[PDB]
Symmetry: C3
């Protein structure tokens, strides 16, 4: 009787699960919203510095209208290699945001110290790897909360809390090529093996090297650590990067997981649209919404506020034809990265983006526990596409206007701002705006004039 | 000198042969029509009970317009596993009809007894495997005839005879989860190994278990049986589910095989249309045509009659824009499962379906050796797509209206009937119909009012 | 720590490199135009005789509108097998032209003799392999020059010189199934091992067999020869047909290589169009342009002339909507195989083809060092598609009109000619043409009337 080879089965549910972390794929939690859970772990935020500049260059004539194709290829070649190290070292990639990603090693509190060594080692191999591209890495460890918010057809998750704030702060300090530990990570780690230098005006520290003791064998130490890793591929499946590669059809699980993934991606998953059409350099409008709270580490406070704000944001995006591309905590606040055009006639798309932004601003300002709303609106050519590895990848955007909109909303809090492309392009009369003082902004060479969107009445 | 790996070659001819059994792929018989051949073998009819109800449910809002995608995924996951057992145990899958299939072990008469043991063992492993889904299995054995009918561009085949009637009868008796043997199968089998219980008002029997004797080794017994299996993958190709996976381009063979496969499937095979678009839940009209004969086990009588009727059916389907989806023998008659919309404006599609049905009814009623024509017309949302395994799969339909149309044509013989969706929707005046008595029908909870299509004149 | 399998990565750059030889992929030469380089090697020109006739037949009704699909399948099945032998024996396939190809073993001068034995052995295995299809093979050896010409967005290469003329001459002598050596190849080869017969009125010779001496082991001899093969897959990559399968993203290299490949192919590479649509039997107009030089073996003379002519050809093809499909040296001249329709309204496409041909004729006639321009214009159904192996394939055309246009331009030099389909179809008045004497042409049974395109004025 033959025992013929069974082919890898690339079911829709498996393709869907490439877009999500094990935290959701295997999570099985309540479908109620907001939902909150609490755990501990180590976080790694990995940033490839330089793709934003490359993005601009790939619009140039030398790329012969294949810029988006070339950009995504060279980006995924590099990011793929990082994704593989993360996964082989046992991490769960939570999200991609442009040319960066955030990973988690969720473990019981006693195991944090050892896993910190695993993550440090991972970081240093990543730092080793391989355009003018640098990698910066921030690490944090401690208490983490997860929030899941949404409606009956869409779900979104976030991690929240001091370790999440720390991992942002750490990454923002890294010089090109640093690996930075949050103060708490440094406090919890195996200091006898981890050799650091100090950081100016900071309690965070920079890793110089690992100095294992005489009897230390990394392979055996890792093996012990894998006792605590619920989904580490093993035994018959030890040749796989993710357990989620073995998921089987299950209509209930697929119904739940598809709610996290945008419809145009589901269309490609279902082989109803060609792959190529989602990788593009297209003119869009970014609307970057920031919500600040009295206490942004307290899920049970902020969770309902985020859900409330989400319910309105989504109804208003539907009307003005925008989408939520990504949601994450900044150091300061919960941020919604929304996109218009991914389109109407262009004075109209611009105008809608602005009216949508004002409406979200007015509504969210009144939501209980939201301290401040800030929104930045910027327009230009940005890269849109699927970034990552075959087994773990996400739709995302990269571009100078994405970063500019983020910087605006942070440096001009409490108001709606827009750049001159948006100002000049909109259908709206000039006295709906106020020309603003030029601020010097981290990461930004020249914004051109910035404006506040004051709105219809005085 | 390198000996580099030669990749699997997924030539068009191999993709075509996934849609057909070895009985045709390797058959090489005359292109004349009707063509008839005679042999012996064992038949297995496997039915997954429950997908028809799931189909209805997958239209519901919770599936978020991905019902067809989810339906086909969960269906193929299960059916694939059945297909693999059939093939590993040496069977040839002849056809898929919705969530059921029919398989054949063609062998010389002396080998029937032993192969019956193979098929029984296969059935019991299938029954073992793994929604509210049950599998029922009927088995028959004996003389089988094959008919091939068609025109210069299209070919269709059928198996005919007492073993084919028996396998239908057997399957219809199975309770959820039974494996039933036809009387003749029971008569021919190795009764010393096969432990059965009786079936009420029936000579067919139900299998309880295998009870092999002391010296029996299934692996060695199977190996002996494979001497008689012309196309069992072996030697260099023992890791393949089908020999047809190794077929090589051959324009003559491809010309002959493509005639069995519908044009929209050939378009997908040739990479001229996206895969996804053939899996759909779409409103269609089913026209289920049943031809009854004086003697439906006699190929040389019925073969010309079927060909004659086919020639007219196909010319009329062309005019009214329908297609033949599947042809099979019922216990009572040869049945053509035709589909409209897989479309025109809807009072028109409905009207055409009805006029086409009357025309086929009038013509076929006069074909020599056709005793009765019955036709059921039902309209609604049905699943359309490719069902099966990668190596063996077919386009088919599943839905409550498909089954209702089959039940109508059987419970209201000698006339054309339609359901109320078709009645109410058609462009035709009411006195073209007669409202019928409500019959209680096996498998059907509520038809709603049924009608006879009386036609234009009184 | 797992070491999971890394999948083959089918990056865009790798897909691009399937369309090009190692001579370009690994060439890294100046982007200036013309560019010329000089080397030595052995050439093999392999022609599958008979596909041109099959092409016509595959338009017939028996192929049921799947002629193009069936043609490309049966062609690639055969050509693939030839490509694999070439590559395993260490050759670099330079180009495909219809059902023929040209391969190169570039080596230092001392190694020519031994490599000639490798190529002969390759030829004889190819000749062994496997419709009414015959293979003919011509071999040459000696000095070869390479020219790269083009503009800022498009690049084309050619090989030039006496060994290139010889390999054309050799192939044209081969009887169905011969392997022919150029005089110089015969002169340079290991005559003690190579058993030949003479060719009438020719110094070229025909191979009968290899007669290795007593101690000769082909495997060990080949192994020695591979010392001189820069890109022979080896060590970890010895299971690969080409080193180019391991190419990594590199935006600069991709920018350079994509310039050789047509835009519609890049669109398919980038998954923005279905594969199937490039394989077709479509009515086109072939414009076959031949440029003759005083000395066609002298790259430094002809290189600038070709570049000059290219610059004008391409600007005129843009205006009249044609494309350059392939460029090669004939025995007599540099030939540009251009195609219109791969379309406008048909009296217009025909008319444009003709006006484009006259314009190219007028311009190129005045280019310094171009002795004669001849152009043949023929219209009909021709096969268009990607021919070759997965790892090495090219877009090309095959058909009786392609060959007729080539024969016209050779048998009617110094003028523009067209066939009667083009004549009768064009929008142009009859006195723009001259009816020509019927010449008997090698390869052509019946042209129908031929015409010179005299042009607008007398
Ligand atoms: N989806 C996204 N794609 C791209 N950028 C984003 C995205 N989401 C947020 N950003 C913002 O872009 C900024 C990038 O940080 P920074 O300006 O220091 O550049 P970088 O990360 O070193 O270089 P590059 O921008 O080339 O990656 C972050 O502050 C972040 O808030
Ligand atoms: N291509 C087809 N797709 C679906 N049903 C079909 C098809 N062809 C025929 N049928 C009819 O549907 C009927 C199914 O049998 P029955 O009503 O007992 O339901 P079942 O098979 O147990 O459950 P389910 O209908 O969910 O599979 C058969 O009588 C058969 O004649
Ligand atoms: N891209 C091309 N596709 C098809 N034919 C071409 C192409 N380019 C040139 N040709 C011409 O077609 C001719 C083929 O040679 P010939 O007429 O002797 O037929 P053959 O090669 O034996 O048979 P077949 O034409 O069936 O392959 C060559 O002279 C060549 O110049
Ligand atoms: Na970044
Ligand atoms: Na069924
Ligand atoms: Na040829």
């Amino acid at each position: 009787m033959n025992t013929p080879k069974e082919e890898f089965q690339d079911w829709p549910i498996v393709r869907i699960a490439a877009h999500l972390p094990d935290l959701i794929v295997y999570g099985h939690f309540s479908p109620e919203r907001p939902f909150m859970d609490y755990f501990d772990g180590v976080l790694m935020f990995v940033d490839i510095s330089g793709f934003t500049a490359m993005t601009e260059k790939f619009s140039s004539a030398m790329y012969m209208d294949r810029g988006a194709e070339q950009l995504v290829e060279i980006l995924n070649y590099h990011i793929s290699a990082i994704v593989e190290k993360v996964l082989i070292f046992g991490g769960d990639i939570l999200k991609f945001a442009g040319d960066a990603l955030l990973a988690l090693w969720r473990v019981e509190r006693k195991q944090l110290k050892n896993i910190i060594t695993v993550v440090i080692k991972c970081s240093l191999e990543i730092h080793g790897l391989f355009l003018d591209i640098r990698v910066k890495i921030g690490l944090a460890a401690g208490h983490i909360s997860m929030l899941v918010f949404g409606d009956e057809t869409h779900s979104h998750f976030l991690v929240i809390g001091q370790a999440v704030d720390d991992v942002r702060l750490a990454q923002n300090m890294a010089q090109m090529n640093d690996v930075i530990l949050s103060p708490n990570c440094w406090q919890l780690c195996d200091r006898s093996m981890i050799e650091i230098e100090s950081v100016p005006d900071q309690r965070a520290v920079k890793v110089n090297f690992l100095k294992p003791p005489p009897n230390f064998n990394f392979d055996e130490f890792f093996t012990k650590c894998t006792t605590f890793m619920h989904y580490y591929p093993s035994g018959e499946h030890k040749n796989l990067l993710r357990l989620a590669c073995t998921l089987k059809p299950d209509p209930e699980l697929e119904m739940s997981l598809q709610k996290y993934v945008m419809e145009s991606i589901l269309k490609q998953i279902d082989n109803k649209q060609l792959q190529g059409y989602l990788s593009e350099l297209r003119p869009v409008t970014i609307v970057f919404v920031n919500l600040m709270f009295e206490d942004q580490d307290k899920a049970e406070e902020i969770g309902p506020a985020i859900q409330d704000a989400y319910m309105h944001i989504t109804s208003v995006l539907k009307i003005f034809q925008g989408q939520i591309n990504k949601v994450f905590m900044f150091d300061k606040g919960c941020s919604f990265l929304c996109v218009f055009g991914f389109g109407e006639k262009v004075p109209d798309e611009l105008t809608h983006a602005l009216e949508c932004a004002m409406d979200i601003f007015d509504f969210c300002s009144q939501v209980h526990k939201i301290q401040t709303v800030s929104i930045g609106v910027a327009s230009g050519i940005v890269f849109c596409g699927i970034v990552g590895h075959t087994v773990r990848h996400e739709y995302t955007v990269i571009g100078q206007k994405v970063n500019l909109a983020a910087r605006m909303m942070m440096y001009y809090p409490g108001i709606v701002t827009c750049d001159s492309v948006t100002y000049n392009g909109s259908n709206l009369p000039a006295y709906f705006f106020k020309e603003l003082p030029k601020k010097v902004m981290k990461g930004v060479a020249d914004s051109g004039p910035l404006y506040q969107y004051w709105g219809r009445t005085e």
